[PDB]
């Protein structure tokens, strides 16, 4: 069969690219002393989440290659936990980055206390703790469902629980973060468009204007990659659609589209930044 083979090749390509990129990013941020700023903490935590997902993906590539799941239940639990961490922590980190950019650009005078290297680590720990509290149910109910075949899935105690899960994820994963991000940037734009000099010198103004644009482009790429998945899920929940053979290709396409985003992020930092490019060159060459 061709579909399984091409989707396995794509999974392995994605895994290799993402592992290389995120390992390079983590190493560069931890090794050098010029690269220790307030935004690189959030970038580092995003990279750690993507690295965990990249360590988990080969088992899903295997399961899609041969339809059986031969690895047991203890591995199923861990792969479901990592998939939840990938879905939730990445958006929570992007939300905190956007709030940080708002504080840095619009309120530079008052917010000088909330931007200190001791206060960012507490916010990162709170991000992880809230993410784990949100993940807890899929961690509890993950298991194996027998079709001779076995599959790693979530066995809801039911259906109504599936329709509840779709809404629970659509509301805590897409809507509430995007509203906050949209408000932050709607306010940031007016301020930039009106002011002449942001911080009193041309160098600080220039750096602020570069970093804000990089962050906005990262968020736009995220939205682009994760929109069709939610459109499809909510469309299937709302109206009754009887499954057809055409309903599998669309689902596989949108899922692998979501998976591609983790690979995409370590490539932007090379074009849209200069310190990251200098460091990547100094390390690799």
């Amino acid at each position, epitope marked *: 069969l061709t579909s399984n083979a091409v989707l396995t090749f794509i999974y392995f390509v994605v895994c290799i690219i993402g592992l290389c990129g995120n390992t390079l990013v983590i190493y560069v941020i931890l090794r050098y002393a010029k690269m220790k700023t307030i935004t690189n903490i959030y970038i580092l935590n995003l990279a750690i989440a993507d690295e965990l997902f990249m360590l988990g993906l080969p088992f899903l590539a295997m399961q899609v290659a041969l339809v059986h799941w031969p690895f047991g239940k203890a591995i199923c639990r861990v792969v479901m936990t990592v998939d939840g961490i990938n879905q939730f922590t990445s958006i929570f980190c992007l939300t905190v980055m956007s709030i940080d950019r708002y504080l840095a650009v619009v309120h530079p005078i008052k917010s000088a206390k909330w931007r200190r290297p001791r206060t960012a680590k507490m916010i990162t720990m709170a991000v992880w703790g809230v993410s784990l509290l949100v993940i807890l149910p899929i961690m509890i109910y993950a298991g194996l469902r027998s079709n001779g075949r076995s599959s790693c899935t979530i066995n809801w105690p039911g259906g109504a629980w599936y329709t509840g899960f779709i809404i629970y994820t659509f509301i805590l994963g897409f809507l509430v973060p995007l509203t906050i991000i949209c408000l932050c940037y709607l306010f940031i734009i007016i301020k930039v468009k009106s002011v*002449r000099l942001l911080s009193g010198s041309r160098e600080k103004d220039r750096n602020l*204007r570069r970093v804000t644009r990089m962050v906005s482009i990262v968020v736009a790429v995220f939205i682009f990659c994760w929109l069709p998945f939610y459109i499809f899920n909510v469309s299937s929940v709302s109206m009754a659609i009887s499954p057809t053979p055409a309903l599998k290709g669309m689902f596989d396409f949108v899922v692998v589209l979501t998976y591609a985003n983790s690979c995409a992020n370590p490539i932007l930092y090379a074009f849209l930044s200069d310190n990251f490019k200098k460091s990547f060159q100094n390390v690799l060459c």
Partner: nanobody
Amino acid sequence: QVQLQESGLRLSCAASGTIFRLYDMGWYRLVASITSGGSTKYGFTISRDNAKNTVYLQTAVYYCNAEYRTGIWEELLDGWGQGTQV
């Protein structure tokens, strides 16, 4: 990127090109300057029309100077002009 043309008492300076916004303009021998909000500062009379990006002022050489950005996420630059004989 920007282009500044001077004319000719009455002196006039006009700007054209690929511009996003125009900040304070001035005439140098500092002889005149006008902030983007009419807040003039001498040290004649100087006026500014922001509909066409033009600055008017009413012996030696006199140059024109402007400040500009080419985008919203870019750096502040300033452009000079040619000379004129009074």
